Design a protein around this ligand. Sequence first.
Ligand code: NA
Length: 134
Amino acid sequence: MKFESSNYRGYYIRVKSFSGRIDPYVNPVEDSMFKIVPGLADPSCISFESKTYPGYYLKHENFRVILKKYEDTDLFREDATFRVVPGWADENMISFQSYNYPYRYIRHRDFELYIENIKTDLDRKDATFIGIKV
Ligand code: NA
């Protein structure tokens, strides 16, 4: 799957140097592509596996969304697990709630990805995505 930003259309979640951001015209476009597996800490949740780096998952660390090799720890699995919810800015779209930090959501901010509290209208828009099956 791919994930487009809804307020920066044509921008996609991608990994650059093992760090999550949103970019247009992702090159190599495979950096924008993930396998969606059951949540490592909860199968009613989701986890994001790298397509180019199998066994690496998107995960938050110091509230920054990064890519990191799987580790056999509860903290890693929790850091790597997100609940898909109706979009903050648009219920026809999606948002990603952190499993171990329930009041923090994946959002972009100067085109980097974090998990942060969603308080304002711009917060909601920065945290809203369109899943695209590829
Ligand atoms: Na903070």
